[PDB]
Design a protein around this ligand. Structure first.
Ligand SMILES: CC(C)CCC[C@@H](C)[C@H]1CC[C@H]2[C@@H]3CC=C4C[C@@H](O)CC[C@]4(C)[C@H]3CC[C@]12C
Ligand SMILES: CC(C)CCC[C@@H](C)[C@H]1CC[C@H]2[C@@H]3CC=C4C[C@@H](O)CC[C@]4(C)[C@H]3CC[C@]12C
Ligand SMILES: CC(C)CCC[C@@H](C)[C@H]1CC[C@H]2[C@@H]3CC=C4C[C@@H](O)CC[C@]4(C)[C@H]3CC[C@]12C
Ligand SMILES: [Cl-]
Ligand code: NA
Ligand code: NA
Length: 542
C-alpha cells in the first residue's frame, strides 16, 4: 500500500485537513443564529460523547485493514452503501467549498490597494443609511450591493458575476495543478501552513479585546440560556457542526489511516487531533463576538440583532476589524491568504480521496495509468457544477446546499456504521482486533460510548427532530416549497445508498430462505483482517 513514513508527518497532515473553513467561517454564523451561549453546552456535550469515540473508531477501522473508505467493508459486504454515501456527501461538500474559496480569493484580490474599498461610506454603491466609524455598516453594504448584487428570491437567477467565475476558475486550476504535481504528498511547509493561522488569529485577538463594547459580546458568547436547551433543532445543529468540523463521514479519515503502520498508536492521535481542531473554533468565536459587540455598541442595537443569520457573517465582521489596524491592506492580505491556505489544504485531500476511491474501485491497470485524466475530469465536472452558484441568486443555493445536503446525513451514516460494527460483527471481536495493534484493550469509556451512549443519543435527537417539526420553524428563510423539496431530496440521496445496495446485494446471494440469505451477506469475506502475513495470527491464521 505504502506507509506514511514518519508519524509526525501523519499528525501534521491530519491537522491540516481537519482545520479549514468549517472552523473560521461555518462555526461563528451557526453559533450566532443559535443564540450564542445557548449553543455552547450542546456543542461540548456532543464533542465529549459522540465526536471523539467515532473519530477513534474510524481511525482504528482504517488502520486495521489497510483499506480505504470502500475497501474496509470486507467486514460486512452488505454495508458498502455506507462508503457510497460517504462519497456522495464528499462530492456535495466539494462542489461549494471551492465557491467559498473563490469568494475568499475575490476578497484577497481587492486588498491590493492603498485604501480598502469597504472602509468608507461615499462609494457609488452606498446609500443614505450608510454609517461608518472611519443604520447600516459599510462592510455589509459592500458585501451585499457590490460583491454579490443579491437578488430578492431564490428563483430569480439574474446574471452571472464574471469576477466570481474568474476566481472560481483560478481556484480550480490551482487545485488541479497542485494535485497533479504533488505539492502536499511529497512536499513541505505544512509546518508553516499549520503555524500561520494561529499567529494571524492572535494578532486579530489583541485588538478586539481592547475595543469598546467587546465585553458585552463576550458575555453574550459565554452566558448559557437554559430555555432553548429543550429543543431538537439546536442539538441537531451542534451535532452537524461537530461531525462536519472533524470530517467524520467524509471518507478521508479511513483513506488517510490506511497508510499507517499496524502498531501505530491511533488513540493518542485521535485525542490530540480532536482537541486541537475543537480548540481553534473557540478562539475564532472569541474574536468574532468581540467584533460583534463593538459593532453593536456604536450602531445603537443589541448584540442579537446587529447582523442577520446568513452565511456571510465572517465576510462582514472580519473586514471591520481589519479596518481598525494600522496599515490595513497588509493585514487584510495576510488574513485572506491564510483563509485561502486553510481552504486549499482541505480541498486537496477531498479531491484526492475521491480520485483514489475511483481508481481502486475500477481495479484494472489501464485506469491506474490514466489517473491524471480522471483527476482532470473530476475537476472539470466540479467547475461546471459550480457555475450556477456565482449568479445573483447563488448565496441562496449555497445556503441550501450547506444546511440541507451536508448537515445530518453525516451523523446518520456514522451511527449506522457504528451499529453495524458493534452489533452485526460483534464488539468482542473488534476489541480483540484493537488489542492486536495497540497492545492494550480500549478504555471502558470508549466501549460504553460505542455500545450504548452515542447510538442512543443520535436516536433520541433524530426522533425528537421529526416530532417537533414545524414548517414555519424549520424553514427560517421563507424558501418556497420546491426549494425545500429539492433540499430534502439532496439530504436523502446520500442516506438512501445503504438500503438500496442492501437489496442489490441480497438479490445475488445464494440461499433458499430470506433469513439464510441475510446471514451469508453479513458474514465477513475471506480476505478480512491484517494485510501483512506476520500479523495474521490467532483467529486469522491460514
Ligand atoms: C480545467 C479546470 C480545472 C480549470 C478551468 C480552466 C478555465 C475554464 C478557467 C481558468 C481561468 C478562468 C478565467 C479567468 C478570468 C476570467 C476573466 C473574467 O472576466 C471572465 C472569465 C475568465 C475568462 C475565466 C473563465 C474560465 C477560466 C478560463
Ligand atoms: C433511517 C434512515 C434509513 C433514513 C433517515 C432519513 C431521515 C429520517 C433523516 C436523514 C437526514 C435528515 C435531514 C437532514 C437535514 C435536515 C435539515 C433541517 O433543516 C431540517 C431537517 C432535515 C431535513 C433532516 C430531517 C431528517 C432526515 C431527512
Ligand atoms: C442512524 C440513525 C439516525 C438511524 C437509526 C439507527 C439507530 C439510531 C438505531 C438502530 C438500532 C438501534 C440499537 C439496537 C440495539 C441497541 C442495544 C440496546 O442495549 C441499547 C440501544 C441500542 C444501541 C439501539 C439504539 C438505537 C439504534 C442504534
Ligand atoms: Cl468546530
Ligand atoms: Na485546511
Ligand atoms: Na474542522
Amino acid at each position: 500500500r505504502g506507509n506514511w513514513g514518519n508519524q509526525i508527518e501523519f499528525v501534521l497532515t491530519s491537522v491540516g485537513y481537519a482545520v479549514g473553513l468549517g472552523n473560521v467561517w461555518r462555526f461563528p454564523y451557526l453559533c450566532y443564529r443559535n443564540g450564542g451561549g445557548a449553543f455552547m453546552f450542546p456543542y461540548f456535550i456532543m464533542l465529549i460523547f459522540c465526536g471523539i469515540p467515532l473519530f477513534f473508531m474510524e481511525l482504528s477501522f482504517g488502520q486495521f485493514a489497510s483499506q480505504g473508505c470502500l475497501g474496509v467493508w470486507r467486514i460486512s459486504p452488505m454495508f458498502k452503501g455506507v462508503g457510497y454515501g460517504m462519497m456522495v456527501v464528499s462530492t456535495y461538500i466539494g462542489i461549494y467549498y471551492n465557491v467559498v474559496i473563490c469568494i475568499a480569493f475575490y476578497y484577497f484580490f481587492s486588498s491590493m490597494t492603498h485604501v480598502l474599498p469597504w472602509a468608507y461610506c461615499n462609494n457609488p454603491w452606498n446609500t443614505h443609511d450608510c454609517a461608518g466609524v472611519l443604520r447600516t455598516s459599510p462592510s455589509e453594504e459592500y458585501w451585499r450591493l457590490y460583491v454579490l448584487k443579491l437578488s430578492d428570491d431564490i428563483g430569480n437567477f439574474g446574471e452571472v458575476r464574471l469576477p466570481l467565475l474568474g476566481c472560481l476558475g483560478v481556484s480550480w486550476l490551482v487545485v488541479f495543478l497542485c494535485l497533479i504535481r504533488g505539492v502536499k504528498s511529497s512536499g513541505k511547509v505544512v509546518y508553516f501552513t499549520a503555524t500561520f493561522p494561529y499567529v494571524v488569529l492572535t494578532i486579530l485577538f489583541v485588538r478586539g479585546v481592547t475595543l469598546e463594547g467587546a465585553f458585552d459580546g463576550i458575555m453574550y458568547y459565554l452566558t448559557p440560556q437554559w430555555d432553548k436547551i429543550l429543543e431538537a433543532k439546536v442539538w441537531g445543529d451542534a451535532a452537524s457542526q461537530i461531525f462536519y468540523s472533524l470530517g467524520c463521514a467524509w471518507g478521508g479519515l479511513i483513506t488517510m489511516a490506511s497508510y499507517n503502520k499496524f502498531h501505530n498508536n491511533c488513540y493518542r492521535d485521535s485525542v490530540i487531533i480532536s482537541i486541537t481542531n475543537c480548540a481553534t473554533s473557540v478562539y475564532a468565536g472569541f474574536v468574532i463576538f468581540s467584533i460583534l459587540g463593538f459593532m453593536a455598541n456604536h450602531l445603537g442595537v443589541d448584540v442579537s440583532r446587529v447582523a442577520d443569520h446568513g452565511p456571510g457573517l465572517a465576510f462582514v465582521a472580519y473586514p471591520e476589524a481589519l479596518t481598525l489596524l494600522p496599515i490595513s491592506p497588509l493585514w487584510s492580505l495576510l488574513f485572506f491568504f491564510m483563509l485561502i491556505l486553510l481552504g486549499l489544504g482541505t480541498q486537496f485531500c477531498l479531491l484526492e480521496t475521491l480520485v483514489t476511491a475511483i481508481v481502486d474501485e475500477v481495479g484494472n491497470e489501464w485506469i491506474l495509468q490514466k489517473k491524471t485524466y480522471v483527476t482532470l475530469g473530476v475537476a472539470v465536472a466540479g467547475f461546471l457544477l459550480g457555475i450556477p452558484l456565482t449568479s445573483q441568486a447563488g448565496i441562496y443555493w449555497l445556503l441550501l446546499m450547506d444546511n440541507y445536503a451536508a448537515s445530518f446525513s453525516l451523523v446518520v451514516i456514522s451511527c449506522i456504521m457504528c451499529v453495524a460494527i458493534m452489533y452485526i460483527y460483534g464488539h468482542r471481536n473488534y476489541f480483540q482486533d484493537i488489542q492486536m495493534m495497540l497492545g492494550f484493550p480500549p478504555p471502558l469509556f470508549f466501549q460504553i460510548c460505542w455500545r450504548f451512549v452515542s447510538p442512543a443519543i443520535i436516536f433520541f435527537i433524530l426522533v425528537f427532530t421529526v416530532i417537533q417539526y414545524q414548517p414555519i420553524t424549520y424553514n427560517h428563510y421563507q424558501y418556497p416549497g420546491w426549494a425545500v423539496a429539492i433540499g430534502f431530496l439532496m439530504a436523502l440521496s446520500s442516506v438512501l445508498c445503504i438500503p438500496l445496495y442492501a437489496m442489490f446485494r441480497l438479490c445475488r446471494t445464494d440461499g433458499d430462505t430470506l433469513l439464510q440469505r441475510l446471514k451469508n451477506a453479513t458474514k465477513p469475506s475471506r480476505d478480512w483482517g491484517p494485510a501483512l502475513l506476520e500479523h495474521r495470527t490467532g483467529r486469522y491464521a491460514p
